[PDB]
Every structure is written in structure tokens, then in C-alpha cells.
Design a binder for these strands. Structure first.
Ligand SMILES: [Mg+2]
Ligand SMILES: [Mg+2]
Ligand SMILES: [Mg+2]
Ligand SMILES: [Mg+2]
Ligand SMILES: [Mg+2]
Ligand SMILES: [Mg+2]
Ligand SMILES: [Mg+2]
Ligand SMILES: [Mg+2]
Ligand SMILES: [Mg+2]
Ligand SMILES: [Mg+2]
Ligand SMILES: [Mg+2]
Ligand SMILES: [Mg+2]
Ligand SMILES: [Mg+2]
Ligand SMILES: [Mg+2]
Ligand SMILES: [Mg+2]
Ligand SMILES: [Mg+2]
Ligand SMILES: [Mg+2]
Ligand SMILES: [Mg+2]
Ligand SMILES: [Mg+2]
Ligand SMILES: [Mg+2]
Ligand SMILES: [Mg+2]
Ligand SMILES: [Mg+2]
Ligand SMILES: [Mg+2]
Ligand SMILES: [Mg+2]
Ligand SMILES: [Mg+2]
Ligand SMILES: [Mg+2]
Ligand SMILES: [Mg+2]
Ligand SMILES: [Mg+2]
Ligand SMILES: [Mg+2]
Ligand SMILES: [Mg+2]
Ligand SMILES: [Mg+2]
Lengths: 49, 50, 104, 187, 159, 176
RNA sequence: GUCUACGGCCAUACCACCCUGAACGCGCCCGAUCUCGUCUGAUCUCGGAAGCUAAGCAGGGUCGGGCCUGGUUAGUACUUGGAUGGGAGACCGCCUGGGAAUACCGGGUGCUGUAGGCUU
RNA sequence: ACGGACCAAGGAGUCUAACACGUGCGCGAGUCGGGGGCUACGAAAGCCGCCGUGGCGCAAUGAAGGUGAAGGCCGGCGGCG
RNA sequence: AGUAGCUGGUUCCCUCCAAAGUUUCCCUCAGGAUAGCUGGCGCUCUCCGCAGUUUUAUCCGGUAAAGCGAAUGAUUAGAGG
RNA sequence: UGGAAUGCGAGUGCCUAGUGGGCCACUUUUGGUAAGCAGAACUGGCGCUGCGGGAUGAACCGAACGCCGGGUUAAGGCGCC
RNA sequence: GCCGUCGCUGGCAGUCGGCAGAGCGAGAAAGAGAGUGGCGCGGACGCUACGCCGCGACGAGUAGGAGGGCCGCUGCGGUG
RNA sequence: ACAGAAACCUCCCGUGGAGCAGAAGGGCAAAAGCUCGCUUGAUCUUGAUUUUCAGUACGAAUACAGACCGUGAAAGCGGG
């Protein structure tokens, strides 16, 4: 029941990244912010939540 | 925002900057996070992060 | 006095402001367009479908009586499995009473 | 900001009747109470119909109430209407009927009472059966108004039997060009 | 401004393929269509009678009528704000039995089957199609030879 | 790519996908220099795609680890074989550096191509790094340090922390 | 194994040349009174059966042409989306994904339906 | 680009007829006295039904002459076969 | 108070929704009619359906590329007959 | 076992103003040597729209607005202004 | 935190008082049901229901539309 | 033979490089071309449909249906 739990969860509203984004307009592999940062999503979660 | 990216950022329920959601991965999901890749920054959450 | 001649710029957005909706798919679609001779024989078939009614019951009630000789011939751990049974408001009422009496 | 669209945020249903009469604004009070304090989706429909305009609750005929109460099974039930119960002079026999409507014309009260049926009101109904058990909700024909004959596909269009707005109807009132296959065409 | 010709802009759409000219095969004429058949349109240019208009070449629809040399089908046409349901009398040579519904049928019958069975054994089988899931974990055996080492090549102005 | 911070030195191996034809394909090790494994796997796929008819989807990364230094306390001489693009053409180079780590010398090579040739971190393509014996070096800027009794003074010791004494009486001294 | 009639997909079946075809057939062939048609019984139609696989036809062959299918070409060309990337531009690189076409080099060279024969 | 020195007052989607839809009200297969008549505010209000003539609604269709809005089973008789 | 498709004005607050310069026809191109987009009033249900989305099957297409020892057309050079 | 994923209450009916001069940008793109030129395609904007940045600015980067306190950012920045 | 709109087609007539018994927020479709046999006289507020109360989400705007004005002007029938 | 670059006859090769009234495109080889035989479906009459489209007309066109016909041994084809 993942579909149902995730649809019971109101989408999280997070604050601005404390410290600050690296660069919003370019992929993470381009030394930016966008895209997939597989392991490193938690470093952003800690400074955003 | 393009309309094709605005339809997917609202089937992901991300109608607002700094919104977040959980997503189970498959072909039909990765192929949407590729359409909306320049607008999101997704990854694999820890257990402490969840 | 040359004026812009033609464009489609905003059109793909006016189309979607009220959506682009497929037509109303109903069952029992109309029979307009079908060929005359065929639809004339289908009308002659409907006009006389009643002619075989008293013979149609003789079979429907038959296989419905036969429905009688049809059917009347055949006729994660022990811990959290016991706790998920004690914690049932109805099924666990007596495993709960057995505990309430337990402290006397 | 959020990227939602407020085109349809305001639902347009009727929150209350538009009339200002006080024998209706008291019925609507009693039925709004029953609607919220009971779990019967009958009272909610009666209330939602007590809001509706005079064109959405049309009159019923005595004959249509006959043939809708003759259907097998629904005997000894009370025929509830929210509009009015008009007479139907082209019916000769009238049974006994328990009825509850807002109005009953002075020549249908006669027939029903001489037959021997009861004519309740909505307060009598609410006291007889609060949850509305033993009732038969009805509503008159809505497309009966002549207005619904001009609606649809516009006239002068292949296979659009829609009535046009004309001063009078006659030989020489919109019968010449867009109707004759001879003079021009027809649809 | 262009012209409104019935056949403007079909030099490649209605032309026959390379070395596929000449007589049209007969399997085109000896196959049957019944009301409800999902048919896709592909205007063949050899036969001129009953040719579907160019705006339908490539669409799918369902049949609703059948005459001697032609059927009538109901294809959806997106017209500038909306999607009308249009009824065209396409001749038989401009039609194929679309094998799209086919796989859905061969999955419906396979479901009805696997539900008939697995009903006496009390088990529970999966009847839905699941998306290709993330590949599970595996061991990659490096039996013997270590992984070959790659490196970029220098540049060579081979122009 | 963007040569952020200090680059790490990663060892990534990876193989194509198993198929009916190739029941098991050969593994392919590469030696990437990038800020973090997320960029290292992407340069591994850039390279594998520029060498073999192989894409990220059609394959998989078998191992992505950081390889440390075998003697980070010995001054070494690294020689690198560049391959980069200018505004007009593309050229191969060979540059030498004195550093303690290989990733250190590679960071110094990216900052040196950036300084001298204004080459952004994405035009450059390291193709071979190798620790060279001090008697095989060629650049005199690196041969000049191959002395056993090296000796030199710090001749112009420009005053830093110019703002802690910001308003002072005495004038600064530069001889030391 | 194979042939005849009617075929299905219509070159892996087509084109050129060469070699071998038992038996039944398939053919060539022999005639023109009758059916029919011509300058002409050549063709067509008709009545035949002395002669023969010569040819068609069948099978095989060719460092065959063609066709079919693979590799290399080539993660190249091209390409969706992206950047306050580069360049004065002309254009170019990079991230995220998709991804060709020659030349060149290999393999293959008709499967098959119903009915009826021969191979007793 | 055009109007405008300053202040006051005046100043621009009105009324009638028709039509359509929506809405409230009364009566409801009917409905309406608007014209006419009878009985200070009142030139109002009330009333008339043998004053409902007439309008609209209750039937359409045809250019017209005209026509004008479910049926079924059952026997018994004649006819075809 | 002639007409004007043309110019200029068109008077208090708050709340809510919110465009178009596009299609076809017009002695039409400084304007209309029409479809679109907008608002208003609702109604029938819910308390299966739908989607400016992807996935999996399945058709469609002659652009980018590529080709001229492949058809059409253009076109350089030798060599062998 | 309501037969892929994710999301979301939908369907329907009247009446309807304003509009029918557009312009800019990424990419493709026609005429032209080109043009802050003429003309198209897709999407986003300005018009109808403030705010921070780009000294300045219809259209560029960020980001869209009830009135306020604290905290954190985007795009841009941090010798002095 | 405050104002407003929208939605919940949300809740409240139960103020049921010495003719009394003060409840319906709690994970699990349905009765704090009936019968049938083994002293001190006491208890805030509410409810113009066109009223009151509770929850979330939302809040730009020309042309245009709609609503609400215990916003304003002058006269008429009532009423203070 | 006269006969020539070019008359007429004959064999062979010939995927259409010809022709199909016109512009171009598409299509066409026991044919859609060429030559003969018989003809008038280029006739009468209902509605449906497509193309432009508002999804209105006109024009043109596609599928039938009812008649009468032509052709051909027929299957069929034909209302330009
Ligand atoms: Mg801070
Ligand atoms: Mg907001
Ligand atoms: Mg032998
Ligand atoms: Mg002969
Ligand atoms: Mg031979
Ligand atoms: Mg950008
Ligand atoms: Mg002026
Ligand atoms: Mg002046
Ligand atoms: Mg004034
Ligand atoms: Mg109107
Ligand atoms: Mg009315
Ligand atoms: Mg009249
Ligand atoms: Mg005037
Ligand atoms: Mg609105
Ligand atoms: Mg708004
Ligand atoms: Mg004008
Ligand atoms: Mg003007
Ligand atoms: Mg083209
Ligand atoms: Mg090209
Ligand atoms: Mg204009
Ligand atoms: Mg104008
Ligand atoms: Mg201009
Ligand atoms: Mg321009
Ligand atoms: Mg403006
Ligand atoms: Mg303007
Ligand atoms: Mg806007
Ligand atoms: Mg803006
Ligand atoms: Mg500037
Ligand atoms: Mg607002
Ligand atoms: Mg022939
Ligand atoms: Mg006929």
C-alpha cells in the first residue's frame, strides 16, 4: 500500500536550503543543483527541512 | 514552465517550490523524472531522513 | 495598411483552457448510416422476435429447473500475530477479559 | 506561489431558496435540521429540492402520478413531490393515494378527497415518517417547458430538429431558402 | 496561402513503397471485418475508389458498417479545439486489422485462464502488468581476469 | 563537469547488461578524477560511451570506490597526458607537476589549464597520469626542485592581515 | 523424396551461363473433317499420340550479378530537454536521454495450404 | 503623442415598444378584464361571469385542396394455399 | 438633437472570476456576423470516471542525417577497349 | 484479484460582455547584403504584472503580489558610493 | 499573528434540570433499548438560525462579468 | 531490292526509361496503355458520408439502397 500511503501524505513543504543552493540552473553533475544526487539527497534534506 | 513539465510537476503534486514527495521507482517514473529533471533535485532518502 | 495575415500562437493554449475532450462514449450507439437492406431485415427480425416467446420460456424455465440438478448435485511472527488478535475490538474481547480477570 | 487555477473554485449550487416567503423559509429550516441531524439521504434531497427554482421543480399531473404509483411493489406508500400536483382531466378513475406536496390544485383536492386519499403536507410527512420510510419521491417532467425546444444544435444545420424563434408561423415565415431543396438548399 | 485540393501533400503518403508496385495482393480482399473491429487506416494509392482523405491516413477507429467493397468506421479527428467522432466509408484496400487489441485479448483470455486455475489451488497469482521494476541485487563473478582498463585516446586530425 | 573543491581519485568498474547473446560481458575499469562519485560515474559513462558502443542504460556500474594514495607523505612527480579543445581545434598536451597525491596533481593540472589556457573543466580530458622518476622529467620548472641541498630565502614577505592593525603608528617591515 | 491443378507471402523465388533428370505427370509434337480464328492451324480452338527431354519445366553448380539477413561503418552523423558554457560572430564543446546511412567484410538463395499422382 | 492656469455649480447607457433567457410571486390545462359596465386622499380601491368577446396555451403537417397523432391475444365465418 | 464604421469624455467603496488580437464569410482590410477564449445562473450524480503525464504492446510518417560504384537531374578526372 | 503507473470528484444545460491592430524571446524557419525590416512554426512572456537582480530598461535571470513578526533562500553579489 | 474568499453541499433547536442526571473524537457496518425464563431547592454564555461556531486550502489583474455595501444624493408610503 | 540518318518487313533485348486530352504529382503491363466487338451507368430516384468548414452552404467526391439498363460464358464492372 505505497500508493495509498504516499497519497495519504500531504506533500512536504520544506524551507529554503540553509547555506544555499550551489547553482539552481545546472545539473548536479554540472556542479549545480538540478538532477539526481543519489546519495547526497540527505545533505540537502538536513539543510532544507 | 513548459506545459509538459507543468503537467508532470502536478501529477507529482509538486505545485510549489521546495515542495517534496516520495516516489517509487520504475520505468514509468524514471521516464518522468527525466522529463522534469531540470525542475527537481531528487535522490535516495536515508532512513534518518525519512 | 498591411495587417498580420494569420497565426496560431495562442491557439494551442485556448484549446486547453477548456480542455480537449474526447466525445461522449455511450453504449448502444445509433444505427444511422448502416445499409438499408440490412437494417430492414434487422427491423423484420425485431418485429417478429416476440413470435418465439412462448417457446423461449419453455427453454428458460427448463434450464432454470435444470439449474437445480446442476447446483444441488455439487451441494510476521507469533508475537505480533497474537497481539494483533488480542487488540481486536470484537475477536479479542475474551482474550482481553482473560487478562482483566488476570489481576485478581 | 502555487500554480492552481481558481476557475472552478466557487461551486454554484443553491445554498438556500431565493424566495422570501416565510411558510417556505420555515419548511427549509425544519428540513435543514432533519438533513443534518439524520443519516437519511431523503431529507437531504427534499432540502436540495426546496432550494430549486420554480422552473426546476415543475408540476406533476394526476395521471403521471397514477402510472408512477401503479408500478408493482410500491403499494401503501406516500407519494412525495416538491412541486405542485396539477389535475389531469383526461383520467377517469382515481385510486386512494397518500400524498405530500407543496401545492394541490383546487380541482385535484376534490378528486383525491372524493376518492378517499390523504393529502399531507411536508410537516405532516416529517411527523409521520421523519427518515422518510415508506415514501416515493417524484418530480414532474423538466423538458416539458416549450423552452427546451429551441435548445440544442442551432436550426439550419444537418439534422437539428430545433425550434426557431419566429414572430408567427405560416406559409411565408422561414420556409423558403434554408428549408427547400428547391430554393437554395435544406439541412 | 495553400490550395484546398483533396490530394494536396500526399506525394509520399499515397505513393507505393519501393519495388512494391503492380497488382495488389488478395489477402487484402479475402479477410473479414465485423462491427467492432479495431481498424487502422493506411491509404493505398493503387486503387483510387473509396480512398480515405489524407487527414485520416494513420488513424485508428472502430467499424460500424459493412458494404460490398467497403466498410464504414468511426475515427476521432482533432479539429482545432475538439475531437469529433467522424464516420468514413473507407474501401477495403485502405485498411488493416490492427494487432493492438490483439495483445489485449490474448492477455484477457490469459487472465481468465490463470484466474480459473489458481482458484482450486487456493494460491494467489499476479494478474496485473507491473512496470519494469528496479533490477534486484546480484553478484558479478570476476572469474580470473581482472577488469580491463580503459582510457581515452589522443586526438588525431584525420580530416 | 566543474572542478569543485579538491578532486577525489575514483576507481570505477562497470559492465554492459547481460543478454541472450552475451551471457556475460567483460568488465571495464576506469580511473576517474572528479569531486564525488556521482560525477565520477557520469564521467565513467562519458568515457565508456566515447570508446565502446555502450550507454548508461544498456549497462551498469559494478563498483565505484575511492582509491587513496599509496604514499601521501612522499613528494612525487606526476606527469599527465591532457586532451583538450580551444576556440579553434583540439590538442594533446603533457604536463608535469610536483605534488604528494595524484588527485592533488590533477587538481593542479585543472587549475593550470584554467589559468594558462582558459580551458573550462569540461573541455579537458585526462588520458594518463603516471608517477615519473626524478631523472625522467622534462619541464625545467619541475627539474629545478631535484636538488638534495636546496636552499633559498623568502625575499619579499608581503604583510598579510593588513586590517587587524588597520590603523597603526609604525610602518610595516618586509625583511625577515 | 518428387510432380500436376488452384493458390498464400510475392527475388532466399529474380537474371546469365553450364551439368543431370528414373517413374507418373507436365510438355514438346502430329494433323485441320468437325467448333473457332487468322496473310498464314504461327497464335487460338478442335481431333489426336508416331516421335523426343532437345527446349520449357525440376534439381544442382558459379571465389556469379541481384535479392535477403548480420557485423564494421558508429555511440559516428543526427537528435529531445538544459546552462549568466565558450566564440565577435560563423559555429563549437558539455549535462540529460534517444540514435542513423554508405563504402568495406560475412552468412543464406524460396518456405507453405488443399486436392490428386509417381516414387508400387 | 494629444487635453489640462486655478476654484465653484451643472455634466453623459435614459424612457416606450418588441423579443429571448434567467429569476420571484398567484392561479394552473387553463390563464388574464388590460376594453366596457356597476357601486379630500379617490384619476384610488372593490365588484361583473349570460361582460372571457378575444389573446396566449391546449395539434401538427401540406404551397394548397385538405388530412390530423399504441395495440395485442382469442375464438367463429369466407378466401388464398 | 440630420447621419458618422471616425475623434474626445463617460461620476462612490470593497470582494471574487478573468480574456482577445485567432478561424470562416462580407464592395470586408480603422467595421461587422460567426467559432473561440470569459463571466453569470444553474442542474444531475459521487461524497465509477478523467488527464497538455509516463509505461507496455501496436500502427502511421520521408524531415535531420545519408546516398550518387542506387533511379532522375547536375557534375571533375584519368585508365582500359 | 475492477486486469499498467501517478495524480485528481466529475458530467451536463441555458444566458452572456469584452475581443477579432498585437509585439518580444529560445529553437526551427521564408524574402532581403542586412535592419530595433517584412513573413511563418513550437513553447514562454510583455500587453493585463508588481517585486529582487541586470547602473538605467515593456520583453533578459530569479520569482509572480491580502496586511504583518522572526528565520532561510533564488538570480545576483561582498574596496567606497 | 490578523483580514477576507473558497471548500467541508461541516457542527449547534440538547438551554432535553428534584417530572433532573448533564455524554457522543472514537481506528473497525450497527442499542450507554425494553420487558421474558434458569440535609441544603442549586447549576456561566448561547440561538437577530438571513444566527452562531469549528476546521483546512487559498488571496495579481486591463477589457469584461458577477456579488456585497450599517457607502452616499433627492423625493413617496409606513414607522421611530 | 531500290531504301539513304529517316519509309516497309523480320528476330532479339527491353520494369515502363512510352502512353494514359491539359499543369505537376501519384498510380497503371495478359492494364488504367494500343487495336477491335457490342453499347449509352454521361439514365430515373431516396436518404447517409467526406473534402473547405462554423463543422453553414455551393462545387466536387465516397459508400450504399430502390428502379430500369449496357456489357461479358460468367464472377463481375458501370449511374461519366
Ligand atoms: Mg546563516
Ligand atoms: Mg499565494
Ligand atoms: Mg534402380
Ligand atoms: Mg505449328
Ligand atoms: Mg530443352
Ligand atoms: Mg536557463
Ligand atoms: Mg488627438
Ligand atoms: Mg493646452
Ligand atoms: Mg456637480
Ligand atoms: Mg439573447
Ligand atoms: Mg419567466
Ligand atoms: Mg395573436
Ligand atoms: Mg444627441
Ligand atoms: Mg467567473
Ligand atoms: Mg484570479
Ligand atoms: Mg473604418
Ligand atoms: Mg482609432
Ligand atoms: Mg515533404
Ligand atoms: Mg540534408
Ligand atoms: Mg489584424
Ligand atoms: Mg480594431
Ligand atoms: Mg511592422
Ligand atoms: Mg517582426
Ligand atoms: Mg499595459
Ligand atoms: Mg492594449
Ligand atoms: Mg495572464
Ligand atoms: Mg512578468
Ligand atoms: Mg547594463
Ligand atoms: Mg485579487
Ligand atoms: Mg483486359
Ligand atoms: Mg442500383
Amino acid at each position: 500500500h505505497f500508493k495509498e500511503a504516499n497519497n495519504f501524505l500531504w506533500p512536504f513543504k520544506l524551507s529554503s536550503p540553509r547555506g544555499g543552493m550551489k547553482k539552481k540552473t545546472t545539473h548536479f553533475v554540472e556542479g549545480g543543483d538540478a538532477g539526481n544526487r543519489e546519495d547526497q539527497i540527505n545533505r540537502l534534506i538536513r539543510r532544507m527541512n | 514552465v513548459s506545459p509538459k513539465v507543468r503537467k508532470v510537476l502536478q501529477l507529482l503534486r509538486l505545485r510549489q517550490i521546495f515542495n517534496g514527495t516520495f516516489v517509487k521507482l520504475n520505468k514509468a517514473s524514471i521516464n518522468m523524472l527525466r522529463i522534469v529533471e531540470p525542475y527537481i533535485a531528487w535522490g535516495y532518502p536515508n532512513l534518518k531522513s525519512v | 495598411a498591411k495587417s498580420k495575415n494569420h497565426t496560431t500562437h495562442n491557439q494551442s493554449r485556448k484549446w486547453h483552457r477548456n480542455g480537449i475532450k474526447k466525445p461522449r462514449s455511450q453504449r448502444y450507439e445509433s444505427l444511422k448510416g448502416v445499409d438499408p437492406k440490412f437494417l430492414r431485415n434487422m427491423r423484420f427480425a425485431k418485429k417478429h422476435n416476440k413470435k418465439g416467446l412462448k417457446k423461449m420460456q419453455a427453454n428458460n424455465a427448463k434450464a432454470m429447473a435444470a439449474r437445480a440438478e446442476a447446483i444441488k448435485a455439487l451441494v510476521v511472527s507469533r508475537k505480533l500475530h497474537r497481539l494483533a488478535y488480542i487488540a481486536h475490538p470484537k475477536l479479542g474481547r475474551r482474550a482481553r477479559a482473560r487478562i482483566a480477570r488476570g489481576l485478581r | 506561489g502555487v500554480d492552481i487555477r481558481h476557475n472552478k473554485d466557487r461551486k454554484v449550487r443553491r445554498k438556500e431558496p431565493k424566495s422570501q416567503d416565510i411558510y417556505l423559509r420555515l419548511l427549509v429550516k425544519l428540513y435543514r435540521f432533519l438533513a443534518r441531524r439524520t443519516n437519511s439521504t431523503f431529507n437531504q434531497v427534499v432540502l436540495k429540492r426546496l432550494f430549486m427554482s420554480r422552473t426546476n421543480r415543475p408540476p406533476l399531473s394526476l395521471s403521471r402520478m397514477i402510472r408512477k404509483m401503479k408500478l408493482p411493489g410500491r403499494e401503501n406508500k406516500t407519494a412525495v413531490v416538491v412541486g405542485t400536483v396539477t389535475d389531469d382531466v383526461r383520467v377517469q378513475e382515481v385510486p386512494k393515494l397518500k400524498v405530500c406536496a407543496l401545492r394541490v390544485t383546487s380541482r385535484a383536492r376534490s378528486r383525491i378527497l372524493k376518492a378517499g386519499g390523504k393529502i399531507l403536507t411536508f410537516d405532516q410527512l416529517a411527523l409521520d415518517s421523519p427518515k422518510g420510510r415508506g415514501t416515493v419521491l417524484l418530480s414532474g417532467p423538466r423538458k416539458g417547458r416549450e423552452v427546451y425546444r429551441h435548445f440544442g444544435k442551432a436550426p439550419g444545420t444537418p439534422h437539428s430538429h430545433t425550434k426557431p424563434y419566429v414572430r408567427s408561423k405560416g406559409r411565408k415565415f422561414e420556409r423558403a431558402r434554408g428549408r427547400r431543396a428547391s430554393r437554395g438548399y435544406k439541412n | 496561402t495553400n490550395t484546398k485540393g483533396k490530394r494536396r501533400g500526399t506525394r509520399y503518403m499515397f505513393s507505393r513503397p519501393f519495388r512494391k508496385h503492380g497488382v495488389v495482393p488478395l489477402a487484402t480482399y479475402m479477410r473479414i471485418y465485423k462491427k467492432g473491429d479495431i481498424v487502422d487506416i493506411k491509404g493505398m494509392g493503387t486503387v483510387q475508389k473509396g480512398m480515405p482523405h489524407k487527414c485520416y491516413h494513420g488513424k485508428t477507429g472502430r467499424v460500424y458498417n459493412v458494404t460490398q467493397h467497403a466498410v464504414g468506421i468511426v475515427v476521432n479527428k482533432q479539429v482545432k479545439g475538439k475531437i469529433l467522432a467522424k464516420r468514413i466509408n473507407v474501401r477495403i484496400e485502405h485498411i488493416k486489422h490492427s494487432k493492438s487489441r490483439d495483445s489485449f485479448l490474448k492477455r484477457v483470455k490469459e487472465n481468465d485462464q490463470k484466474k480459473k486455475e489458481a482458484k482450486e489451488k487456493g494460491t494467489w497469482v499476479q494478474l496485473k502488468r507491473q512496470p519494469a521494476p528496479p533490477r534486484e541485487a546480484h553478484f558479478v563473478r570476476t572469474n580470473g581476469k581482472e577488469p580491463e582498463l580503459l582510457e581515452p585516446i589522443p586526438y588525431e586530425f584525420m580530416a | 563537469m566543474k572542478a569543485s573543491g579538491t578532486l577525489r581519485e575514483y576507481k570505477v568498474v562497470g559492465r554492459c547488461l547481460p543478454t541472450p547473446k552475451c551471457r556475460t560481458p567483460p568488465l571495464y575499469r576506469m580511473r576517474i578524477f572528479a569531486p564525488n562519485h556521482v560525477v565520477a560515474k557520469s564521467r565513467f559513462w562519458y568515457f565508456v560511451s566515447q570508446l565502446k558502443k555502450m550507454k548508461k542504460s544498456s549497462g551498469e556500474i559494478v563498483y565505484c570506490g575511492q582509491v587513496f594514495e599509496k604514499s601521501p607523505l612522499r613528494v612525487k612527480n606526476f606527469g599527465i597526458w591532457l586532451r583538450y579543445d580551444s576556440r579553434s581545434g583540439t590538442h594533446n598536451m603533457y604536463r608535469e607537476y610536483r605534488d604528494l597525491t595524484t588527485a592533488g596533481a590533477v587538481t593542479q593540472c585543472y587549475r593550470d589549464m584554467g589559468a594558462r589556457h582558459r580551458a573550462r573543466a569540461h573541455s579537458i580530458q585526462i588520458m594518463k597520469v603516471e608517477e615519473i622518476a626524478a631523472s625522467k622529467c622534462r619541464r625545467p620548472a619541475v627539474k629545478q626542485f631535484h636538488d638534495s641541498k636546496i636552499k633559498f630565502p623568502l625575499p619579499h614577505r608581503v604583510l598579510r592581515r593588513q586590517h587587524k592593525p588597520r590603523f597603526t603608528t609604525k610602518r610595516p617591515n618586509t625583511f625577515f
